[PDB]
Design a protein around this ligand. Structure first.
Ligand code: HEC
Ligand code: CO
Length: 106
């Protein structure tokens, strides 16, 4: 629902992916992450509450989720092919992007 909930969903499901036993488990976790990222994209983070909704910072925040979703969709392709280790490695690529948004806006 709220931004913090979406972030907890992202964090929890990344851990699910790391411990997963098959690619369908990775797929199910990635699917939840995709929805949480799109929900978070509609939020205004506390650090930007005073900025204009049309500000460059707000568009940058939103675009961070578009890039994250693209990564999730690429990992989903691998998971849907049964490639568990590759899909797990693709999911780890997410982390630098999580951190880059946090450095600016957390
Ligand atoms: C911006 C484009 C973000 C991306 C990509 C990711 N996160 Fe994030 N996260 C973002 C903000 C603005 C905040 C602060 C939220 C607030 O209301 O203060 C956060 C916070 C987190 C947290 C802590 C949330 C909490 O406990 O309340 C976690 C655990 C977290 N984020 C995880 C996380 C992961 C794993 C991401 C990539 C898969 C990720 N975030 C991306 C902004 C953005
Ligand atoms: Co990237």
């Amino acid at each position: 629902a709220d931004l913090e909930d979406n972030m907890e969903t992202l964090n929890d499901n990344l851990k699910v992916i790391e411990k997963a036993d098959n690619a369908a488990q990775v797929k199910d976790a990635l699917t939840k992450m995709r929805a949480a990222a799109l929900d978070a994209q509609k939020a205004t983070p506390p650090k930007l509450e005073d900025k204009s909704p049309d500000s460059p910072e707000m568009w940058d925040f939103r675009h961070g989720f578009d890039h994250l979703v693209g990564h999730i969709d690429d990992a989903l392709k691998l998971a849907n092919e049964g490639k568990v280790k590759e899909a797990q490695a693709a999911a780890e690529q997410l982390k630098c992007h999580c951190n880059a948004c946090h450095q600016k806006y957390r």
